[PDB]
Amino acid sequence: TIPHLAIDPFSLDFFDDPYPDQQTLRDAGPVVYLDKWNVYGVARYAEVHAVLNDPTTFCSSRGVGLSDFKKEKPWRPPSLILEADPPAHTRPRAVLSKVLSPATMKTIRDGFAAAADAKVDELLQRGCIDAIADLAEAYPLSVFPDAMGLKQEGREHLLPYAGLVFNAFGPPNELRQTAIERSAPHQAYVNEQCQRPNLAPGGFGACIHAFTDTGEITPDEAPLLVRDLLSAGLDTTVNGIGAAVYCLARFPGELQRLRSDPTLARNAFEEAVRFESPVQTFFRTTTREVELGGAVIGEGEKVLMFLGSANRDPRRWSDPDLYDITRKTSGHVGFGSGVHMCVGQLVARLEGEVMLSALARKVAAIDIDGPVKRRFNNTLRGLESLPVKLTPA
């Protein structure tokens, strides 16, 4: 009763243009079996949402990549939050929820917005820029490592480590295998910076360690929460912002709508997350036999969730392939849903809001002006190089 499909969702040809294959996955049925990797797949909105919100049956503690932690050793010690189930998940999650809390956003907003305005003004002095290197990567590198309270030395390891993290969720294809081999120096840098002495007081990393006084985490749990942030907090926003600029470069009507009301900047960013879905996929593992979408899947099976496809499902979104900055975006699964919903979403949305605010107020047009090159990663969707022309307002 379950369709068997040969599509490899981690193939370069797939990354290069996933939308035809994503419809095939949706229209084949509510649940598919992917023979290439021996996993179940869900790519419609209703099923992806249901699986995200059924944690006792579709767990995260056996890994959210292809690899089943009950069968193989994880390539690094498991996250106490992303790769954990309640009740173990709950208290460390609450620490990150408080460290990256609404009150914390107040302490960083003026700096983050100032850095966004200054970058766009800088880029307008150049004219010819690469919106990935000079913008999508440059701005988060200028705000987020400082907000973490990281020292200067070694920051050149941050994006290499993140590319390794996100590739490692995938199957053992060349991308994953090449990322993990000789990754020791990236791991050694990050793990060192997770230790309390190297984290500047008043920063995210120091604040995490400060919660060891409360009883929510032990001193030995704090470095792995810092690692959570060092794994997910930079590269996600780079492709988040990169997608936003790509969307505005391709939908001039929507850049003009944003220009005429900069307060749409926050929802402009949310719609970019839905539209491009910088985080394409995560896995769950079944803890028991379960019927999903009229299909019986056994215990101990990997289930691949197509978050991007779920955000483009015509059963849920009208005109899903249109970028619409006034779309009612709530319910999209670009940040997950349920108990593991992105704990960093306030930092991501703040970085996205203020850079898009800067664009809205300062830029009149954004024209692609050179060869566009895609960046392939087993989990992340984004560009390697986006040469654009910035016309001042």
Ligand X SMILES: COc1ccc(C(=O)O)cc1
* Per-residue contact string for residues 8-37; x = within reach of ligand X by CB under 6 A: ------------------------------
Phi, psi of 306 (to 5 degrees): -95, 85
From residue 314, how far is each of 221, 311, 322 by CA, in Å? 42, 9, 11
Q: Is the dihedral of CA 310, 258, 256, 371 positive or negative?
A: negative
From residue 15, how far is each of 19, 66, 284 by CA, in Å?
9, 17, 21
Provide, rounded to whole angstroms, the least separation between the CB of residue 341 and ligand X. 10
Give the nearer residue to ligand HEM in terms of CB position, either 2 or 383. 383
Identify what 60 binds: ligand HEM, Cl ion, ligand X, none; CB under 5 to 8 Å per kind: ligand HEM
Query: What is the total count of residues that contact ligand HEM (CB under 6 A)?
Result: 28
Find which of ligand X, Cl ion, ligand HEM, none residue 308 binds, CB within 5 to 8 Å per kind: none
Cα–Cα distance between 283 and 52 in angstroms, integer? 10
Report which secondary-structure segment, H or E, holds 92: helix 90-99
Note whether 99 binds ligand X by CB under 6 A. Answer: no
Contact 264, 271 (CB under 8 A): no
| 165 binds, options ligand X, Cl ion, ligand HEM, none, Cβ within 5 to 8 A by partner type | ligand X
Please report whether residue 226 would count as binding ligand X according to CB under 6 A: no
Residue 231 is a binding residue for ligand X (CB under 6 A): yes
Contacts of 17 (CB under 8 A, 6+ apart): none
- Between 2 and 344, CB nearer to ligand HEM: 344
What is the smallest separation between the CB atom of 340 and ligand HEM, expressed in angstroms?
4
Would you give the binding string for Cl ion spanning residues 54-83, x where CB under 5 A is met? Answer: ----------------------x-------
Helix pair 235-250, 265-276: axis angle to 10 deg: 100
DSSP string spanning 283-321? EEEESS-EEETTEEE-TT-EEEEEHHHHTT-TTT-SSTT
Q: Which residues 182-241 are close enough to bind ligand HEM by CB under 6 A?
A: 228-229, 232-233, 236-237, 240
Residues of the binding site for heme b: 89, 93, 284, 340, 342
Residues that bind ligand X (CB under 6 A): 79, 81-82, 165, 228, 231-232, 236, 279
